[PDB]
């Protein structure tokens, strides 16, 4: 059981996934739009993400989670709402940092990304 930990948000246009880890970085539990119960396009919605971060927080609290640090990746439309859900969840939110991977003109993207 861990009091302080990490909160990772992978939120894309198609879905939002939330994983709660220990301060070492080992996941303790995770959730997503599918885990809450949605399918198809509904997974990408803000409301889906809200439920996701919660179920991610609820399970986390049950293992002794109190404090978290929120790490954000992805520019989805359900992003900020995930952040809202974690604060109003009963978790500490000691910090919130966006760490979306951006290349320095690395690999050529797919056709739809040019």
């Amino acid at each position: 059981q861990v009091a302080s930990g990490r909160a990772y948000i992978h939120a894309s246009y198609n879905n939002t996934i939330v994983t709660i880890t220990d301060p070492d970085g080992n996941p303790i539990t995770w959730s997503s739009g599918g885990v809450i119960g949605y399918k198809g396009s509904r997974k990408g919605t803000p409301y889906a993400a809200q439920l996701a971060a919660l179920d991610a927080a609820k399970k986390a609290m049950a293992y002794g989670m109190q404090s978290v640090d929120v790490i954000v990746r992805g520019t989805g439309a359900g992003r900020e709402q995930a952040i809202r859900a974690l604060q109003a969840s009963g978790l500490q939110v000691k910090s919130i940092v966006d760490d979306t991977p951006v290349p320095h003109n690395g690999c050529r993207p797919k056709k739809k990304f040019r």
């Binding site: 910090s95 919130i96 940092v97 966006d98 760490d99 320095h104």
Partner: protein, 68 residues
Amino acid sequence: AKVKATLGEFDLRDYRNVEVLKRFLSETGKILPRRRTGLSAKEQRILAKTIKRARILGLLPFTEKLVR
């Protein structure tokens, strides 16, 4: 809030002056535009070129995470 103003006489070509240079980077690590640095056309290139040099030398970051 132009950075060029808030400093005295300083060398643009000086890649080991980490304390001067660190002021020219954004909180996210990116090199700041002229509209923020107050440098002229010619000065910007000298600045940019030496900032990159320093990054290789470990004195300056290539990127830094965005805290809220």
